[PDB]
Amino acid sequence: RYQQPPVPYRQIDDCPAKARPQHIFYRRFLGKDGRRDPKCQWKFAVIFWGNDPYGLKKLSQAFQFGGVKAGPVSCLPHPGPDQSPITYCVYVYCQNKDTSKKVQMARLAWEASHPLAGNLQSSIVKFKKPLPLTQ
Amino acid sequence: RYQQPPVPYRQIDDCPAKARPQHIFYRRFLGKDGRRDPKCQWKFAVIFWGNDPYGLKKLSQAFQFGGVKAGPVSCLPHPGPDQSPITYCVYVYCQNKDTSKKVQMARLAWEASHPLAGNLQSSIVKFKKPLPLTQP
Amino acid sequence: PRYQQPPVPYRQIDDCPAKARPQHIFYRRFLGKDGRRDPKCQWKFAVIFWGNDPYGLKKLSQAFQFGGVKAGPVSCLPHPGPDQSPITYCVYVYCQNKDTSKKVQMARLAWEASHPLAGNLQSSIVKFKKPLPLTQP
Amino acid sequence: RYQQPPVPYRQIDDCPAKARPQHIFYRRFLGKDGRRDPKCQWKFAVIFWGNDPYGLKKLSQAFQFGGVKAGPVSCLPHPGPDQSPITYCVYVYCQNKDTSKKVQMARLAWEASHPLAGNLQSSIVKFKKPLPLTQPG
Amino acid sequence: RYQQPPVPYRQIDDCPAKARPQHIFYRRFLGKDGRRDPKCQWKFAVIFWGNDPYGLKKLSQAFQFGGVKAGPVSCLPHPGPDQSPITYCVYVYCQNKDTSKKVQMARLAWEASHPLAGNLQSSIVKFKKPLPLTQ
Amino acid sequence: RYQQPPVPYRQIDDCPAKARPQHIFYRRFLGKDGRRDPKCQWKFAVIFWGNDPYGLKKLSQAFQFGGVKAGPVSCLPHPGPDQSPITYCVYVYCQNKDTSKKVQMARLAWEASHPLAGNLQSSIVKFKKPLPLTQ
Amino acid sequence: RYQQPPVPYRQIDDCPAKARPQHIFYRRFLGKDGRRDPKCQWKFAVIFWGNDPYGLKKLSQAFQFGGVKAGPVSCLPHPGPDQSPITYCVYVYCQNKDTSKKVQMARLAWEASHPLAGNLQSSIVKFKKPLPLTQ
Amino acid sequence: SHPRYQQPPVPYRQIDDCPAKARPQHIFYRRFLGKDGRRDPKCQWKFAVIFWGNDPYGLKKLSQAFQFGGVKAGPVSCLPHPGPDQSPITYCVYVYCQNKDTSKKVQMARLAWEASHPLAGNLQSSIVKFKKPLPLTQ
Amino acid sequence: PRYQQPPVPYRQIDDCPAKARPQHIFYRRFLGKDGRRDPKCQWKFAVIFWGNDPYGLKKLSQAFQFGGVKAGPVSCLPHPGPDQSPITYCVYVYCQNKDTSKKVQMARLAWEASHPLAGNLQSSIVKFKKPLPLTQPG
Amino acid sequence: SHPRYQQPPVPYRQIDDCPAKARPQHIFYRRFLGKDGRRDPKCQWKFAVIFWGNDPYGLKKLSQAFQFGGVKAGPVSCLPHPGPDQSPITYCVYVYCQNKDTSKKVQMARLAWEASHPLAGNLQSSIVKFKKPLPLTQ
Ligand SMILES: [Cl-]
Ligand SMILES: [Cl-]
Ligand SMILES: [Cl-]
Ligand SMILES: [Cl-]
Ligand SMILES: [Cl-]
Ligand SMILES: [Cl-]
Ligand SMILES: [Cl-]
Ligand SMILES: [Cl-]
Ligand SMILES: [Cl-]
Ligand SMILES: [Cl-]
Ligand SMILES: [Cl-]
Ligand SMILES: [Cl-]
Ligand SMILES: [Cl-]
Ligand SMILES: [Cl-]
Ligand SMILES: [Cl-]
Ligand SMILES: [Cl-]
Ligand SMILES: [Cl-]
Ligand SMILES: [Cl-]
Ligand SMILES: [Cl-]
Ligand SMILES: [Cl-]
Ligand SMILES: [Cl-]
Ligand SMILES: [Cl-]
Ligand SMILES: [Cl-]
C-alpha cells in the first residue's frame, strides 16, 4: 500500500536487469568501501536528487551493498505554496564520510561515462543519531 | 512505487482531515519558527522512523509550512542480506538547526498528549549542500 | 496571614486542584523521566514564566509539581517605573539542569499550543551561581 | 488574594518607614550603580533567602531604585514530599553582574552594621532573556 | 622624625577609641576574610589616598587583623617640580585579590553610613614579590 | 604631627647633601627613563624595605625625577599581634614596568659600588588605578 | 634521441586515436577541475606505475588539460644491483591536492568500466617548490 | 625490455661501471653522500628530488651519476608542455631516496658539484614526497 | 700562537689585571649569583659590546671573567664597505641565559654612570641556536 | 690600526684580491651563495653564523673566504676558556649577514665544502641572532 525498500541481493543476477550495469560498475569502483564496516555506525548518506524518477530508481537498485544501501525513490517537498514539477530523491546510506564521498564520485563517474544519464544534484548527509541498519 | 510529494495547503480546508488536528497543533506550536526564513538555506531535516506507515503519513501531512516541509512516507533500506519488517521514515526539512530541534519537540508534545500515537524515533539531519526548497 | 506560602506537594495526580489537573497530567507525561528528582544533582536552574493573569499563573504553579521540577507561588516582578502600573505576575519553576529547564519551557509552550484559552506566557531560563536549598537530607 | 509588587518611590518620604534606614544606606552605597543605564538589559538578579519574612520585606522595600528593583517577599518550594518550615525569598533585579555583586555587598554591609538584622543567604542569578523592567518604548 | 607602624591588637579593647567603631564594623564585614590565611603570601594591598591625614589615621588603626594590616599614614610624593598640596595615603596589606576588593568595599560601606567621612580614592595593588608579614 | 613628602628639586644643588651621590648616580643611570612621559599613567612603583631608616631616607631623597618619584620613609605593619622591630619602606613611583625594573637595578648598582652600606629588599609594584601624580 | 613530452591539444581530434576514449571520459569526469587555475601553483601530481608501457602511454596521452598535465612514459629505477623487469611510470601534474585525488579516482573509474585495462598502482605526490607549468 | 620506450639507468657495482662521462660526478657524489648513499632498511621509498632544466645531456650525466644503495635516479624524462603548443622542453630527472634528510643531501650535493664546476648547468630542483611507498625495495 | 688568545682566567681578584680590577670587582658584586655557573643551563647567550676605543673594550673583556659570565677577547666587526674605514671593535660576553645577558648589559651601564670618563658602549643581546663549548671539562 | 689589537679582514672588489690560500673556498662560496651573497638593502644586520674549532689556520681561510656584500666574516677570534684553568683554545669566526635565510645558506656552503674535502676541518657552528642591528650598513 505504501512505498517499499529495494529488495536486497547477494548475486548479480538478482539485481534488476536495467540497473545491473550500474550495479557492477559500483561494485568494482567502490571495492572494499562497499563492504559493511563492522566497527562504524550508520550516520551518513548521500542524497541524490533530480526530475527523472526512472533514472533514480536505477541508481537506487544499483546502490545495494554491505556498507552502501539506498532507500527507494522518494521526493522532496514542493518548494513553494503551490505545486510545481516534482524533484525526486534517493538516500544512499553508509557508515562514514569517506564512503559517502566515494558514492558521490561513483555516480559522477557513471555520468561521465554515459552522457545520456541524468546529471544528478547531490549532497553529503549526516545524522546526529545512528540509523537502524545493523544486521 | 513512484511517490508524489504531499500537497501543500491554502487553508486548513486543504489539509487531509485525519492529519488536521496534528497540523493545527504544529502550526501553533512552531509559531514563527514554522514560517519561511528566506534569510536561510535548506540544510537541515529531522528524520522520523517507525514501523507504522499510517502514523508517519499523518505526521507527513501535518508538517507542511513555509519553513518546515515533510517529504512523503518513505523507507529505510533492509538492514541485511534478506528482507526484514519495513522501517518507514519521513524527512521533515527545515532551514536551521534550532527549528529542527523544535520539530522534534513538537512531535514529542503531540505524543504526550496522545498516548495511542506511535512513539517515533528520530534524528536531526544536516546537509552539506543546500536543498532546492527556495521559493520560485 | 500577610505572607505567601509555598505550593503544597502531591501524593497523587488527584491532589492537584481540578482546574490545573489536566495541565499537570500533560506535564507528568511530557517531562517523563526528567520530571523525576535526581538526588545527585544540585538546584541551580529555573524557568521564570511571566504574564498578566495571575489565575493562569497559579494553575501553572499548581501544575509544575514533581520530584525534579517545582514551581514557587505566584509572585510579581517589580514595577518598571516611578508609579504603580499593570502587574506582571511571575512564577519560578525550579529545575536541576539546563536541559530540564528548556524542557519545562517547551512543556508550557505545548500546553498553550494545545489550549488556545491558555495565556501566552513569556519565559526565560535562569541560572543560579549558588545551589538553592531544595535538597533533602 | 494575589501578591502585589512593592510600591515604587519618588522621594525618600514615600518609602515605608521601617525600611527607610536600609533604603538610605543602599542609595548611598550603590551610588551610581543604583541608577538605570540605558545601555543595558535586565538580565541579572540577586536572590536573597532566609526564614524571616519581615526582614525580607524591609529588604524588598529598601531596594527600589532606577537600576535595582526588588520583587515582593516570596517563597521557595518545599524541598521534599512533605511540608517543612517556610523559606522565604526576595529577588532583587539588576542590569548587570557588577551591580548584582554590589547588591550582595550592600546587604552584607547592612548586616555588619546592624547585629540585630538577620543573616540572609544569597545567590547571583542570570536570565537568558531580558525581563520586562524597561519602560514602554 | 621617623614614622612608626600602628600597634597590633588581640582584643577589641586594644583599638584606639576613635577608630574602634570603624574597627568593629570592619571586623564584622570582613569576617573570615579578615583572618590570617597561613598558607598564603602577602602580595596585595589597597592604597587609599585623600587630603585629610586624620581620617586616614583612623582607617589605618581600623584595619588591623590577622590577614588585613594597614601601614601608618604616609604620603604620595609631589606631582610636579614644586611643592603642592599633600596627598596622604595608607596601604592596607592583604594576602589575596579577593580580600583587597573586600577591603575597598568595606570602606565604601563605612563612607555610605557616615556622610561626614572622607570619600577616599583607592586602588588595588599587586606586589611581584611577597612582603615580610608572616609571623 | 604627620609625615610630609620629599621636597622636589631640579638642580643637583637642591638635593639634600646626604643623598647627592646616590642622586647623581641615579640621574645618569636612569637616563631617559628618569624623565616624565605624559603618554603614560602612574601605575607602577618599586617598594624598598629594610631595618635602617636613614639608608631609606637617602634613597627617598635621591629618587626625585620627572618620571621617578619616591615617597617618604614609611613602615610596614608589625607582622603579628605583638609589636616587632620595625621594617621601614619607601615606594618609588614611576610610569611603566620597564622603568620600575630600571629603578630596581639602579639601587642594586648602587649597593654593588658601596659594599659597606646596607642592602634593601625590593619588589616591583602594580596599581589597578593610576595615581594622582600628573602635573 | 631524448624523451619528449606528450603533444598538447585543444580539440579532441588532435588527441591520438588510441587515447581518445580515455581522454573523453577524463574530460567529462574531471569537469571544472580539469581547467587551469592561474592563481594556483603546480605543486601536486599523481604518479601511476605498472609493467605495461602501452597502457601508460594512453593514460599519458589522455591526461592533457589546462589543469591536469601528464609527462611521458618514464621509468622507476631498477630496485637492485641487477637489471630486473621494468616498472614504467607516468606523472600526472595538478595544481592542488583535491585535483590529485580526483585524477586518481578518474583512473580507478576507468579501470572499473574496463576490466581489460591494467590495474595501475598510484600515489599522490607533493612538491615543495612549484614546477614551471604556468602559461 | 621494450624498444619503443624509455629504460632506467643501468645500475652498477664498482665505480668503473658508471658511464665514462658521468663517473667524476659519480665519484664526487659518492664521497659527498658518504654513508647517506646507502640503503636505509628501516625506511620506505617515499621521497625524491626532482631536478629540471633545458639541457638533457647535463641531466643524463646526473641521472647516471646518482645510482647508489639509497639514492636512485630514474632516466632523463620531461615535464609536459606548459601551454597549448609544443614549446621548449624542460627535461627532468627524479632522484629517489628513502627519507627527507637524504633527499636534502642529494639536493645539496648537486649544488656543490655546480659551485665547484662552473660549466655544469644550474639546475632547478625540488624535494618531492609520495603518499605511498614506491616499489624500490629489496 | 700568533693568533688571538682569550683572556687569561683567574679566580682570585688580585690575578685580574690591575687596570680592569675595579670594573671586575663591581661586576662580581652586581651580578652576584647570576655571575656563577649553573650547570643546568646551556651556553646559548651573550652580549656583544662595540665601539671605536679598543682599550676600553679590553678592560671590559678582562673584567667579565666569572663562572657563568665569560668574555672573549677584543675582536672586530668586518668593514662595512668595499674599502677600509675606521675600525669597530667588539667584545662578546657569553652567558647561560637571557636574564643574565640583560644583567650584563645593566652592569656595564652602571659602570658608565658611575665613571663618566668611560666610553659609552653600544650593545646587543645575542642568541645562539646551538650551545657553545663552555662547559667545564669533567 | 692599533698594533695591540685585532683588525678586520681586508675587503675585496675583485677575486685577485683574495688571499691565495682562501681563493678556492672564496669562489665556491660566491657560486654556492649566489644571489644570497649580495647586500639585501631592505634588511638590517641582525644575524650571523659562528664557526668554531681548534685549528686557527682553517678558520683563517674561512674568514678570508666569506667576504661579500651581504655575508661578512670577522677576524679569527676565540671563545673564553671554559674553566678556571688555561685549556686548549677554541678559535671562532663570526660570519655576519642580514637575515636568517642567508645565515643558513652560509652554514650550508661551509658544510658542502667540508663534504667535498676530506682534508678540511669539520667545523662546529651555530646560527646567531642579534636583538639590535650591528653597524654594518654605512
Ligand atoms: Cl556535498
Ligand atoms: Cl553494521
Ligand atoms: Cl537527534
Ligand atoms: Cl495556566
Ligand atoms: Cl500561589
Ligand atoms: Cl483551551
Ligand atoms: Cl530562554
Ligand atoms: Cl511596598
Ligand atoms: Cl533583618
Ligand atoms: Cl553568588
Ligand atoms: Cl581598583
Ligand atoms: Cl644604605
Ligand atoms: Cl620584583
Ligand atoms: Cl604625567
Ligand atoms: Cl595515494
Ligand atoms: Cl598556471
Ligand atoms: Cl651539467
Ligand atoms: Cl626544495
Ligand atoms: Cl691600548
Ligand atoms: Cl669557571
Ligand atoms: Cl671616570
Ligand atoms: Cl639588546
Ligand atoms: Cl644552528
Numbering used by the authors:
A (entry chain C), E (entry chain G), F (entry chain H), G (entry chain B): 1013 to 1147
B (entry chain D): 1013 to 1148
C (entry chain E): 1012 to 1148
D (entry chain F): 1013 to 1149
H (entry chain A), J (entry chain J): 1010 to 1147
I (entry chain I): 1012 to 1149
Excerpt from the paper describing this PDB structure:
Latency associated nuclear antigen (LANA) is a 130 kDa multifunctional protein required for TR-dependent DNA replication and episome maintenance during latency. LANA binds to two adjacent sites in the 800 bp GC-rich terminal repeats, referred to as LANA binding site 1 (LBS1) and LBS2. In this capacity, LANA acts to form a site-specific origin of replication and as a molecular tether between the viral episome and the host chromosome.
A comparison with the DBD of EBNA1 shows that the two proteins share the same general fold (RMSD of Cα atoms = 5.1 Å) despite sharing very little amino acid sequence homology. A central, anti-parallel beta-sheet forms a hydrophobic core through which two proteins subunits form a dimer. Remarkably, the crystal structure of LANADBD reveals a higher-ordered assembly comprised of five dimers interacting end-to-end, forming a decameric ring with an exterior diameter of 110 Å and an interior diameter of 50 Å. The dimers are arranged such that the DNA binding surface faces the exterior of the decameric ring. The interface between the dimers is small and hydrophobic, consisting of residues Phe1037, Phe1041, Met1117, Ala1121, and Ala1124, and buries a total solvent excluded surface area of 963 Å2. The surface opposite to the DNA binding face of LANADBD is a dense basic patch composed mostly of lysine residues. Consistent with this, the angle between dimers in the decameric ring is approximately 110°.
